[PDB]
Nucleic acid binder design. Structure first.
Ligand SMILES: Nc1ncnc2c1ncn2[C@H]1C[C@H](O)[C@@H](COP(=O)(O)OP(=O)(O)OP(=O)(O)O)O1
Ligand SMILES: [Ca+2]
Ligand SMILES: [Ca+2]
Length: 1122
DNA sequence: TAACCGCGTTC
DNA sequence: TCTTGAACGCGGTTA
């Protein structure tokens, strides 16, 4: 066992040891390993109650190693809650395996005989299996690839086999030995083509192959787990959510080496607790209540403990008592868990021994028996909030519907002494926000996703949405006996017309800014209808209205009883627009947007990677390349120069110290070529890279195995369910008298939840599109991605061509159009059936959908109708539909400050309600914008509603515009300094650490440097640094990069403040230290200026209005036009 | 100037 | 190791 001459003895011993500690920890938390009783009877699912075993709700799984009870045996532990409120775990053992592919299927026995002997040391078993290969000729006729399936006792032996085979695999494509040159059987090694399914994580392999999912109920029996399809609802796990608050020096981050834990707030199954560190918290806190809304009950019991070690002993003892199987936190992986771990180490406690939590290979904290649900991981991936709204406060407002307690971090340590009850109140607010966010958003979503994705809750919360897509597809391939492709790898080098490409992609979404300014439900607009368009709509009308009834409402025209009246109402309204083209009336503010655009384009056209090759449907995409201007001549020039040079060894642990170019990896060579071809091309030409768009054509086989596209259709439908439930409940709130309140607040709460669930499905669904372009994708197709995008572009431009003939489109982006139609354009109508029921009709929506189905329907969709005889039918598939929302009270579109340009992805929209309907792209939404423009925008957009005329509204908005410019002209204020610095500060997140930006300049890089010089180097040691700065006046003539002054200096001791200010301002004589005298008011004038222009001034000129805010000047390009 | 970058949006 | 995509706005810096 401990023989130091054995391969992998130290790794085997340790991996078995870790399994033994986990078995010991699970046992303490009430997860004994349960072996079901012996039963040698019928192994069927019906009469489940006859078969002995234990019923459980599956709450977790982990890979492990068991001993035979030499090496360990690979298995997965499954963690169950039982029907009598107990818990247990059960182990399934399962040989890890991968495939060998052969080029000669006639000599499979020979390669089998070789590998059996070559892999004696690590191979266990070997077997011939067959699988469908979607790259194989005539696979559609039932022909199968023949594979050698290599099995192992554990995951290490499988990795040992991979290390032994890679030598063989490389010489088979880099060696053809010569010997007798006049000889005009082939060795068995060379028949080895490839290995397949060799990198599937073990626990995924077991979850997929055995069809087990967390979230589902099983009876554990001698023959296997048997899903109890009668068990409905999840079991109720013990859930625990905690927040810690630590001491920290003024202006500095906590450091667990020195800083103490003050308190731990937590909730368990809705009951609140607070532990206090009495060495820091001035007094015993008593049992109090925080219930911010009656559905969020917050009664807390206090444990006043004597010191930090008693606080940690209390936390740990309580966890062992309640035995939680979920523990939830907010950013607990990055802060709370590592802090507790360090304070545990310092006081001589082992956190693993106490509660079985420990850091994993990614530094995240995890246990065997208990999921760690970091709500922040759900906020980043699933909540659909902008990064500016991912804090506790904004998440709580948005999802829970209330303001949680907030406290300046600089007051938190002082307040433990001066205001312990205030701090305890805050701490307990953090626990309450966390517990209820997990219970109402994270818990249902993640545990339900587990029932279809073969991952445990920890991985289902944290894995990329691409990886979630990949897992779903891997189940479908497996269950259809489809062989998995290996992970894709980018070609190290590609050429376009003898030039070396720097980057390849495709043309994506089509987006247009057409008009700027104000549009209102009451303010009138001018139109010029194209008469042609009305004749076409009249020719299309009888088929468009039929289409509406039959396709959009799945009805029949036999049962509609007001068809001709509707047709004539619309027909009369159209005929008037043809005679009276030039009109000036009330505009109707409308939005049309295709439901699930890319997934339905994919679905409609049978788009999937394996389908890209009469089964031929030819679709176009727009390839965009970026390449070096140099020809092949000049490339071979640069290469030859590099071959005369020497290069640092990437291996420190050698006396070599220098490599030749040829000795470098192909990749590292190409990196060196790219560096050189850059600088060369700047000297023989103007530009480092030239782009070029080439339209390409691809074949989409309509017959291929549709496992990929079917998965997308399935997940689309999963999302639609919650989309309709959102609508269903938005309909119920419209039929409720404002007064009820009880029925109002239940509905408003149900709409938030189903919008949240449908939006949580949106990024995963759309990642099925992006997954074909992901690094390491098993199903990579740049063609598929380009086809989806170009088709979307063609569709949205067809829509705009119609709308701009019968109305005025304002802004268009990928699948969406904001426009104004005349008040006298046929709008909303209701059909009547022979059963008294009704059918919605928006003519402006249906006029488009009719044209979409006329022009973008796939008439070549094939489906296998008889799998035994291989009989396909062909049908017509089209699931592409515009949805209409509105009409809306007002929409305001900014304009650029450069000539004949617009702003895309930025606008505001109001209901007749007065309520803000939409706000996009604007700094007030974004993270870390100057708070002035935030608060400005936050205020000015809402006042576009007040006034009677267009000049009237542009001057009512100008009143606020001048009042905001009357804070900034004061070079100061008439309100206090604590609310000045906040109005004037700029946050700006550094995604990385300060050392990794070397050779770059920015307001952030500077603020970080200066913060490190004044408060210590360990202030910039971590990534995600918030750089809270002001920009100085001095040096007067220096780049704005310099003059980034960390606003924290204005909270520093006088002699530190003065010394650093002087050192940065380059002014040794400076005495005046007031914040009002160092601010470059010229910079902030230009930036509130440049906002007021784009939202008020330049739009006014576009809508034939004199500058309604004369304080701000028009640019020269505009003024030389007026 | 023209080209380019980092952040954080809208799709 | 793990890793969805492109298009765009804004304020920056560099040969
Ligand atoms: N996060 C994303 N990842 C990849 N593609 C995306 C993403 N968001 C949007 N897209 C692409 C694919 C979508 O079909 C298209 C239109 O986006 P959008 O209209 O916001 O959503 P959608 O049309 O898919 O759903 P819906 O309109 O029903 O909310 O843009
Ligand atoms: Ca907190
Ligand atoms: Ca859409």
């Amino acid at each position: 066992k401990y023989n130091t001459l054995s391969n992998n003895y130290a790794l085997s011993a340790q991996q078995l040891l870790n399994a033994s500690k986990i078995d010991d920890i699970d046992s303490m938390m009430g997860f004994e390993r349960y072996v079901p009783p012996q039963y040698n009877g019928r192994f069927d699912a019906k009469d489940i109650d006859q078969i002995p075993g234990r019923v459980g709700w599956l709450t977790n799984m982990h890979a492990t190693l068991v001993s035979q009870e030499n090496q360990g045996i690979s298995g997965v532990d499954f963690y169950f809650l039982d029907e009598e409120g107990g818990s247990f775990k059960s182990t399934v053992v399962y040989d890890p395996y991968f495939f060998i592919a052969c080029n000669d299927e006639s000599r499979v026995n020979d390669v089998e005989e070789l590998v059996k002997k070559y892999l004696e040391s690590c191979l266990k078993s070997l077997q011939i299996i067959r699988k469908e290969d979607l790259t194989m000729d005539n696979h559609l006729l039932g022909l199968q690839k023949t594979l050698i399936k290599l099995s192992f006792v554990n995951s290490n032996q499988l990795f040992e086999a991979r290390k032994l085979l890679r030598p063989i695999l490389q010489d088979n494509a880099n060696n053809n030995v010569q010997r007798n040159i006049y000889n005009v059987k082939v060795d068995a090694k060379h028949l080895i083509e490839d290995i397949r399914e060799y990198d599937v994580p073990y626990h995924v392999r077991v979850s997929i192959d055995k069809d087990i999912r967390v979230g589902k109920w099983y009876k554990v029996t001698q023959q296997g787990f048997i899903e109890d399809t009668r068990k409905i609802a999840f079991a109720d796990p013990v859930v625990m959510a905690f927040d810690i608050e630590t001491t920290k020096p003024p202006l500095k981050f906590p450091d667990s080496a020195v800083d103490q834990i003050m308190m731990i707030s937590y909730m368990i199954d809705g009951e609140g607790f607070l532990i206090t560190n009495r060495e820091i918290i001035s007094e015993d806190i008593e049992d109090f209540e925080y219930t911010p809304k009656p559905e969020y009950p917050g009664f807390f019991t206090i444990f006043n403990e004597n010191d930090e070690v008693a606080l940690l002993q209390r936390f740990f003892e309580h966890i062992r008592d309640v035995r939680p199987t979920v523990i939830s936190t907010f950013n607990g992986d990055f802060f709370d868990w590592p802090f507790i771990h360090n304070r545990s180490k310092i006081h001589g406690l082992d956190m693993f021994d106490e509660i079985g939590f420990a850091p994993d290979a990614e530094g995240e904290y995890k246990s065997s028996y208990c999921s760690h649900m970091d709500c922040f991981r759900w906020v980043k991936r699933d909540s659909y909030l902008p990064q500016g709204s991912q804090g506790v406060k904004a998440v709580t407002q948005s999802k829970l519907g209330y303001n949680p307690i907030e406290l300046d971090p600089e007051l938190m340590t002082p307040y433990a002494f001066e205001k312990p009850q205030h701090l305890s109140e805050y701490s307990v607010s953090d626990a309450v926000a966390t517990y209820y966010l997990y219970m109402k958003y994270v818990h249902p979503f993640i545990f339900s996703l587990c029932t279809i994705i073969p991952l445990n809750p920890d991985e289902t919360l944290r894995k990329g949405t691409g990886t979630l897509c990949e897992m779903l597809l891997m189940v479908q391939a497996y269950q259809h006996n489809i062989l998995l492709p290996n992970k894709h790898t980018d070609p190290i080098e590609r050429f376009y017309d003898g030039h070396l490409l720097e980057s390849e992609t495709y043309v994506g979404g089509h987006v247009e800014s057409l008009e700027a300014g104000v549009f209102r439900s009451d303010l009138k607009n001018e139109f010029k209808i194209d008469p042609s368009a009305i004749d076409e709509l009249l020719q299309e009308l009888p088929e468009a209205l039929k289409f509406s009834v039959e396709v959009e409402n799945k009805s029949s025209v036999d049962k509609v009883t007001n068809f001709e009246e509707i047709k004539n109402q619309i027909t009369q309204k159209l005929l008037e627009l043809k005679e009276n083209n030039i009109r000036n009336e009330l505009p109707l503010i409308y939005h049309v947007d295709v439901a699930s655009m890319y997934p339905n384009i994919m679905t409609t056209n049978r788009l999937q990677p394996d389908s890209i090759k009469t089964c031929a449907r030819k679709l176009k995409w727009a390839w965009r390349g970026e390449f070096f201007p140099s020809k092949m001549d000049e490339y071979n020039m640069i290469k030859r120069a590099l071959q005369n040079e020497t290069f640092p060894n990437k291996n420190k642990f050698s006396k070599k110290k220098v490599l030749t170019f040829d000795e470098l990896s192909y990749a590292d060579q190409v990196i060196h070529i790219k560096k050189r071809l850059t600088e060369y091309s700047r000297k023989v030409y103007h530009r480092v890279k030239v782009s070029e768009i080439v339209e390409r054509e691809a074949i989409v086989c309509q017959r291929e195995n549709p496992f990929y596209v079917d998965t997308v259709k399935s997940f689309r439908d999963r999302r639609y369910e919650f989309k309709g439930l959102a609508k269903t409940w938005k309909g119920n709130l419209s039929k409720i008298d404002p007064s009820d309140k009880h029925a109002r607040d239940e509905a408003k709460k149900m709409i938030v939840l189903y919008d949240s669930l449908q939006l949580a499905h949106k990024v995963i669904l759309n990642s099925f599109y992006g997954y074909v372009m992901r690094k390491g994708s098993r199903w990579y197709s740049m063609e598929m991605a380009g086809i989806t995008c170009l088709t979307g572009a063609t569709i949205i431009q067809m829509a705009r061509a119609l709308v701009e003939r019968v109305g005025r489109p304002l802004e268009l982006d990928t699948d969406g159009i904001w426009c104004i139609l005349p008040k006298s354009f046929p709008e909303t109508y209701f059909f009547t059936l022979e059963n008294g029921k009704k059918l919605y009709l928006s003519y402006p929506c249906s006029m488009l959908n009719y044209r979409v189905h006329q022009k973008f329907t796939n008439h070549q969709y094939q489906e296998l109708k008889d799998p035994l005889n291989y009989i396909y039918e062909t049908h017509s598939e089209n699931t592409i539909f515009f949805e209409v929302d509105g009409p809306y009270k007002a929409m305001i579109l900014p304009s650029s400050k450069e000539e004949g340009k617009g702003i895309k992805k930025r606008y505001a929209v109001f209901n007749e309600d007065g309520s803000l309907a939409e706000l996009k792209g604007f700094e007030l939404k974004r993270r870390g914008e100057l708070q002035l423009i935030k608060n400005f925008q936050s205020d000015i957009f809402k006042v576009f509603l007040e006034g009677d005329t267009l000049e009237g509204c542009y001057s009512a908005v100008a009143s606020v515009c001048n009042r905001w410019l009357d804070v900034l002209d004061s070079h100061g204020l008439m309100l206090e300094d604590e609310d000045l610095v906040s109005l004037i500060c700029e946050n700006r997140s550094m995604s990385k650490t300060l050392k990794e930006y070397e050779g770059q300049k920015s307001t952030s890089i500077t603020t970080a440097r200066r913060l490190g010089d004044f408060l210590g180097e360990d202030m910039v040691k971590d990534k995600g640094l918030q750089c809270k700065y002001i920009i100085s006046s001095k040096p007067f003539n220096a780049p704005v990069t310099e003059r980034a002054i960390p606003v924290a200096i204005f909270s520093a001791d006088i002699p530190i403040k003065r010394s650093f200010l002087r050192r940065w301002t380059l002014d040794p004589s400076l005495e005046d230290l007031d914040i009002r005298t160092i601010i470059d008011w010229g910079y902030y004038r230009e930036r509130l200026g440049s906002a007021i222009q784009k939202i008020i001034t330049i739009p006014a000129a576009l809508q034939g209005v004199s500058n309604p805010v004369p304080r701000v000047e028009h640019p020269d390009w505009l003024k030389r036009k007026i």
